[PDB]
Amino acid sequence: APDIRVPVLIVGGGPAGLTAALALSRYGVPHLLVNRHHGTAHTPRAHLLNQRTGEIFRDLGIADRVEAHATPGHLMANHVFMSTFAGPEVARIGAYGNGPDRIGEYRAASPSGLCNLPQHLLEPLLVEAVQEACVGQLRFGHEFVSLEQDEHGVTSRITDRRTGRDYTVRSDYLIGADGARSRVLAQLGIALDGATGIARAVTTWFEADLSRYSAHRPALLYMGAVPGSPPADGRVFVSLRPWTEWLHLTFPPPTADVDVEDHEAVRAGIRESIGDPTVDVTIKNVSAWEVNSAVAPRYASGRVFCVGDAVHQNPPTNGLGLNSAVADSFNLCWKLKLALEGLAGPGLLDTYHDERQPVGRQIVDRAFRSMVDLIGIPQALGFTEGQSPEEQWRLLDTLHEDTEEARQRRAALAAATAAIHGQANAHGVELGYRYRTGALVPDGTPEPADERDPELYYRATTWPGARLPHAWLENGRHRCSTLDVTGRGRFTLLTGPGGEPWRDAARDAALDTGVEVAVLPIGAGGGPRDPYGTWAELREVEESGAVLVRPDGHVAWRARDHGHAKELPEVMARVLHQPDPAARR
Amino acid sequence: APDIRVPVLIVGGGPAGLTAALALSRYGVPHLLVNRHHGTAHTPRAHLLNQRTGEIFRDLGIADRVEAHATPGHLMANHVFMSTFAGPEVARIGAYGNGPDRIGEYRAASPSGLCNLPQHLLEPLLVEAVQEACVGQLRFGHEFVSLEQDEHGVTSRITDRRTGRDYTVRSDYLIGADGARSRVLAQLGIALDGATGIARAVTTWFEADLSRYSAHRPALLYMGAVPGSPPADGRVFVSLRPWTEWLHLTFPPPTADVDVEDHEAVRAGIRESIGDPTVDVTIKNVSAWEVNSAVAPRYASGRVFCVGDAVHQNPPTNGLGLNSAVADSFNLCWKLKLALEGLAGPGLLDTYHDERQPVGRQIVDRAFRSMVDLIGIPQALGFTEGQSPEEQWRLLDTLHEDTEEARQRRAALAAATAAIHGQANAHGVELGYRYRTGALVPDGTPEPADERDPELYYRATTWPGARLPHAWLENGRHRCSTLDVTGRGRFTLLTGPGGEPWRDAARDAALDTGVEVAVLPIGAGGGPRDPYGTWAELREVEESGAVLVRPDGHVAWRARDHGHAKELPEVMARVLHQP
Amino acid sequence: RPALLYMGAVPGSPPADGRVFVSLRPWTEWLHLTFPPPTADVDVEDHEAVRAGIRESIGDPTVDVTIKNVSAWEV
Ligand SMILES: Cc1cc2nc3c(=O)[nH]c(=O)nc-3n(C[C@H](O)[C@H](O)[C@H](O)COP(=O)(O)OP(=O)(O)OC[C@H]3O[C@@H](n4cnc5c(N)ncnc54)[C@H](O)[C@@H]3O)c2cc1C
Ligand SMILES: Cc1cc2nc3c(=O)[nH]c(=O)nc-3n(C[C@H](O)[C@H](O)[C@H](O)COP(=O)(O)OP(=O)(O)OC[C@H]3O[C@@H](n4cnc5c(N)ncnc54)[C@H](O)[C@@H]3O)c2cc1C
Ligand SMILES: [Cl-]
Ligand SMILES: [Cl-]
Ligand SMILES: [Cl-]
Incomplete structure (x- = not known):
């Protein structure tokens, strides 16, 4: 009970x-x-x-x-690599x-x-x-x-x-x-x-006016190295409220004791990362995180x-x-x-x-x-264990010199810096993931692909499993996305000029499944307009075709033309996995 | 096709x-x-x-x-009766x-x-x-x-x-x-x-800074009578943006030339209503409507x-x-x-x-x-057709004398003013209407009644047909009305301590009718609290009882206690008029 | 639909009778440009004619229009 x-x-x-x-x-x-x-x-x-x-x-x-x-x-315009916050900079990307x-x-x-x-x-x-x-x-x-x-x-x-x-x-x-x-x-x-x-991370939440070292190079992440440190001893500043509220991350060795309650010692580590003793640091929290x-x-x-x-x-x-x-x-x-x-x-x-x-x-x-890419930057500079502060300041200084050694260090730094786009501009990872199996019916087209790195570069598609492409529509005088007029707990069928057979098809789908499919014509039927022509460019179906959008804004199905309208009721049954034991496995 | x-x-x-x-x-x-x-x-x-x-x-x-x-x-704190906007006032109510x-x-x-x-x-x-x-x-x-x-x-x-x-x-x-x-x-x-x-109403939308004549007696409505006019020639000033944007309403007799495009004429009329020729009047629109x-x-x-x-x-x-x-x-x-x-x-x-x-x-x-109540004010003051400006100024001034004549007009003014509560504070009309037949099951209790004018006075009740009474609840630390946690396209059953039997009853009601009844315990079962105890006072059912609320915030049904739980399925079938 | 240039055509006009709105202070101060035919008598002092044409270009008579200046310019 x-x-x-x-x-x-x-x-x-x-x-x-x-x-x-x-x-x-x-x-x-x-x-x-x-x-x-x-x-x-x-x-x-x-x-x-x-x-x-x-x-x-x-x-x-x-x-x-x-x-x-x-x-x-x-x-959050940059990702910065530096020495101390007050010292010389090493590298920068958008x-x-x-x-x-x-x-x-x-x-x-x-x-x-x-x-x-x-x-x-x-x-x-x-x-x-x-x-x-x-x-x-x-x-x-x-x-x-x-x-x-x-x-x-x-x-x-x-x-x-x-x-x-x-x-x-x-x-x-x-x-x-x-x-x-x-x-x-x-x-x-x-x-x-x-x-x-x-690894362990020690994350310190603190207040300090660091605007003199940050405002000219706005960033979420400032990754530092105090000259005289091994490459693994990186110091990560995270901007929370520009430019007064911060996180500071260190990665202590497996055999170091971290006293999360030792604010004194944590304050002195942060002052060393900053390299400017006139900056007052107030600790708000220290946490150790496995x-x-x-x-x-x-x-x-x-x-x-x-x-x-x-x-x-x-x-x-x-x-x-x-x-x-x-x-x-x-x-x-x-x-x-x-x-x-x-x-x-x-x-x-x-x-x-x-x-x-x-x-x-x-x-x-x-x-x-x-x-793992992060350690590449201090390595490219020639930083190692067992170096004095003076030796590391000299490596930073000699970076810009007219020698074979310096040319090669500048090349290695440019290569180490290029790889950080994998975390700073990973657009394909963030937005471009596509479901290849699940609540979707393939249309028999190949997945779009190109020569660009798919981790860095997003490519908009209505291929089933993909997140619906964004385009600016206008509903009367209301600016709204394709993503704003879909989702919200329902299936939506996006249609265009010559799409009338989709209405009866959607009607039959709802009768067969008890699930409503809202028909939404774009650039036809008095519906939202496509003022730039962008939706017609991205939809990858003809005017008389259709894109079936799930409640989460992923595409369940698409159809080149109204020749496929009669498939919609069977498409909706398969997407909903409606328990038909005669249905075809 | x-x-x-x-x-x-x-x-x-x-x-x-x-x-x-x-x-x-x-x-x-x-x-x-x-x-x-x-x-x-x-x-x-x-x-x-x-x-x-x-x-x-x-x-x-x-x-x-x-x-x-x-x-x-x-x-919109007052309703004002006056002479001109710049002249002496006649009456005021909240x-x-x-x-x-x-x-x-x-x-x-x-x-x-x-x-x-x-x-x-x-x-x-x-x-x-x-x-x-x-x-x-x-x-x-x-x-x-x-x-x-x-x-x-x-x-x-x-x-x-x-x-x-x-x-x-x-x-x-x-x-x-x-x-x-x-x-x-x-x-x-x-x-x-x-x-x-x-009647014919002429409505002028205009801009004029009248802050000097309004700010000390804030109102939606300033109802004026230019001395030397019949009682039927009232000027209604409506505040739209305090105190620079206005409407001016008039009721010309059913026989009179109403040139809506004659702005200079309307403008002269508004200036006369104001009674201060230094106030600039910009006409934005003039409309006649029946x-x-x-x-x-x-x-x-x-x-x-x-x-x-x-x-x-x-x-x-x-x-x-x-x-x-x-x-x-x-x-x-x-x-x-x-x-x-x-x-x-x-x-x-x-x-x-x-x-x-x-x-x-x-x-x-x-x-x-x-x-019809509006003419009663200028009538109480002894205004009639065929009087001079000076005649009506004299009646305004004499109203406060120690005469029997002045005592009587004073009493007639007070009675005519009191009637304006029927437009200025008509709370029972605005909120207190109750549906007595329709998408509801009466509970067999007699309708609550009292001695107060039911046009003026709202009386909160969960008597089926009434608008669900307002009480402040708190859902965690979120302040919300009884009216906020009901409505929004669904049926809600408000319950209390000992209301668990309503769970099975709402589920059976959903099976039989196909319509979901959301069960919402107040002050029980970790649901929203009644921090003041106001809801417990207004709900007019016991702790274990229930108030069934429609998608529009009206009560469809109530039940004194959990013994009525078994009735919910048939109640829902009768509210939805299922064959 | 923020723009410098909004180029209008009042239905029932010849193609050459374009109306160009230019945004100067979004969205309360404007230029209105026409290209009258070489026959037309342009009266740079007839504010009320110019006003009626702008109202026409706008297509909403509830919009109050205050003329600051009219100039003819030889392109
Ligand atoms: C200390 C710490 C610091 C972090 N810092 C960062 C960072 O700087 N950057 C970053 O990108 N990511 C960070 N992360 C990870 C990040 O916070 C998570 O990715 C994010 O919170 C998404 O987590 P979630 O909601 O799945 O789980 P969580 O945020 O962990 O929340 C799960 C919740 O469940 C509760 N819970 C646990 N067991 C029970 C139970 N038996 N019964 C009821 N409740 C239970 C917990 O109390 C907790 O509130 C950090 C994680 C931790 C633990
Ligand atoms: C000139 C005027 C002034 C008013 N001033 C006041 C006031 O000061 N105070 C006050 O309390 N009330 C006033 N009212 C009344 C008030 O506006 C209404 O009570 C309120 O507008 C609610 O109206 P509604 O939506 O039912 O109808 P309406 O506001 O009349 O709107 C109905 C709409 O239907 C449209 N329409 C008509 N026929 C057709 C058709 N065949 N096909 C398609 N559409 C059609 C019309 O274009 C109109 O827009 C005024 C009314 C008018 C006409
Ligand atoms: Cl806790
Ligand atoms: Cl939002
Ligand atoms: Cl709201």
Whole structure:
């Protein structure tokens, strides 16, 4: 006899969990979320919000609230390598699409920019949105202990940490959003692939007016090396509030004792990284963080689905962790809604693993290689163990000399610096991932490809599994994206001139499946216009064709022309995995 | 074969029709709206937004946009009777719940205030919200010509006025939102009851800095009488942007040359009303419009439903027309949504007329009686036709003498002033209307009644048919009304401690009817809190009981205790009029 | 749809009767350029004719138009 019955139990109220609660809130699905801690994040942790996250927050209706508090992209314009903050600079690249060679592609790719908003500010914004909708319930100070699942539901044991009293929750489904060392994932018998404690990071949150060393070269990341240090002893400054509020990251050797409470010693390390004793440093927090590089081989078992840091862990390079957490929960929730309605079978819920687990592998691999690229810069300079400050100042000074030695060091520094685009301008990784199996019906066309590095370069496509291309439309006098007039908990069929047969096809699809397909003509039927012609360029179907958009803004299917309209009802049945045991496997 | 097939055609793009397109947008219902004019309203027209409209705009997600542009309630604090604007004042009452004797009741009654936002500003906000949703389609410059309907739908003939191209729309339902002289209502064979041209009103929109004559007595309405005029020649000043943007209203006798383009003449008239020839007056527009008071005996026929000015017309007094237009469309759209999904029949759509026609009768009668009350002030002062300026100045001055004559006029003024509460503080009209037949199950309790004038005084109740009472809840640390956590396209069952049996009952109701009833415990089960205990006081059920709230914020049913749980499935089948 | 140049054509005009709006102070101060035919009598003092033409170019008579200057220029 269970204490609570609810359609969905969310375990964990970090970004992944709160994203799932907000999505289910927007879709009208009652849920309970339990979070072990009494409050939201009390330190910055992850901060970089990429364009995909920006699009998901527009769909969930919180983008304006996030933007009001976040650092804007133009104050993240560079990625800097330096000696001390007050000393000579080593190298610099354009970051986050601000450089003239990337800014066009970044603007064409999304209605959203990149911005910077740390977790102690983001999480309260998600909490407020969830409380305002009043569809599900948040319980902070409540700890998940264990689960059993069966054919029909999931029975979970929960502890109220204040009262010490246990209770049980019976749910149709459970979301594991409980972060690294997930108890939910463990209870499923799923063990991550990869290494644990591959490094420690010591992250210090502090206040210091460093505007004299930063404002002329605005950046999110200033990566420093104090002359007389081995190459591994890099000092990473992260701008949180230009140019007064900061993180400082060090990577202590495996055999160093870190006293997180020793503010005195941490303050002296930061003053050494700055190299200007007149800058007053106030410590706000110091945290030691075990860095892993690991990914779950399976994301789900039965009626339990794990998201975010429960199924992927990586170094902070690329800032992919937070963005991938948001996109995991946004992939899953519209699928749980249709299953709970009886409009989709367990076959649709299986596509969560099929679509998201390969992205988990991709981001863990990319973040690892970007962490290893960092040491290339001080190596190119000729920095090693056992060098005096004076020897390293001389290597920096002799860098610009008219010798064979200096020419080769300048070449090695340019090559080491070029590789940092893999973390500063990784547009293909951020926006260009495509689901190749899952809640989609291939059209028989080959995947578009070119000679450009697919990690660095995004290429807009309606190929099924791809995120729908962004184009500026106009609805009367209202400027709106292709991504703004799709999603929001429904399927949308984008059509054009000569697309009338799509209306009866969509009508038949909804009758056969009980799922509505909204028909939206662009540049026809009095619908939104394509003022620049950009949508006609990107849609890759003819005027009479169609692009079928899922509730998460990925393309489920496309059709060159209205010759394919009669396929739509069967396409929708296959996307929804509607349990037809005669249906064709 | 029709040109266009669409669930709902809305005819008319004023407040009523734009509200319907916004509600249908929020509910995900594809629709088409045609409006004969190429633009939204080009002059202020209706401006007073009452608390109930504020609540509906909170439901439809646009109340913050409206509030950013509107005059706030505290700047509409008085209703003023005066001579000239620059001359001596005659009388004053508190307005719109600003007086100390009404402010408490107005604050407890709603999460929303009253505000002032003219139609030329409000209509673009609704259009923008509809275009942003991109669920339905707006076509301005398109004119409805005629319809025919059958068992299965409605076929309308439309003309594109710029091209003269004609086309046909086949819709399941049609909303007539086409305003006064509704072409849609006519084609239904339904004629209004009440008179036409009961008067002519001349409305001048102008700019003048009158802060010196208004700031010390903030009002929406300054009602003046230039000494040497008959009582019927009242000048109504309406504040639009304190204190530089105004309307000036007059009621010329049904015989008089009204040149609307004669600006220099209107301008001279406004200057005389002000009584201070140094004030610069810039005319922005002059409009003549015929004041009616009629109400349709029937709001609907078959698959066609008429809202707002199509079905009720009244003088501007009480500003009920704009508010009632919004509440008509909000009553109707959630019922259409359940009808289109096959979860309700024509029986639910019949409740539109049953609920809203009686409110149309009430507002037309109240507004007429409020218009008639206005002449009572100048009459109390002893003003009549055929008096000189000096004669009327003398009567103003003598009003405060220690004579019997002056004692009597003083008493007659006070009584005529007290009647203006029926337009200035008519809280029971604005918020307290209750549906007694329609999409509701009466609980078998007698309707709460009391001694207070029910036009003036709102009495909060969960008696089925009433608007759900406002209480402040807190959901975690988020402050929210009972009205914020209900509505928004769904049925909600508010419960309390010992209400667990309502869980199984709502699930059974969903199985039998196909309509979800969201269960929301207050002060139990980790749900929203009632920090003051106000909700426990207003809910008029026990802790273990239930209040069933409709998508429009009205109560469909209540139950004293959890023993009534087993009744919820049949209650839901009767509210939805399932065969 | 922010622009320096908004080039209009009032339906029922010859192609050569283009109306060019030039944004000078977004969105309250403007130029309006026409190219009258070589026959036309241009009266740079008839503010009320010029005003009626701008209102026509705009297509919304609720927009108040205040003339600052009219000039004819030999291209
Ligand atoms: C100390 C620390 C510092 C970090 N700093 C950075 C950084 O600088 N840059 C960067 O890019 N990434 C960083 N990360 C990772 C980043 O914070 C995550 O990628 C991001 O929060 C997404 O995580 P999530 O919501 O999946 O999990 P989390 O943020 O870990 O949240 C999961 C939540 O579940 C709760 N929980 C755990 N067990 C239970 C249970 N049994 N019952 C109920 N609740 C439970 C936890 O209390 C926690 O609130 C850091 C991580 C940690 C742990
Ligand atoms: C000149 C004027 C001044 C007013 N001033 C005041 C005031 O000061 N105070 C006050 O309280 N009330 C006033 N009103 C009334 C007030 O505007 C209405 O109560 C309010 O507009 C709500 O109206 P609605 O949406 O029902 O209709 P409306 O605002 O009349 O809008 C209906 C729309 O339908 C369109 N239409 C008509 N026929 C067709 C067709 N065949 N096809 C397509 N579309 C069609 C019209 O173009 C119009 O835009 C005024 C009305 C008028 C006409
Ligand atoms: Cl804690
Ligand atoms: Cl938003
Ligand atoms: Cl709002």
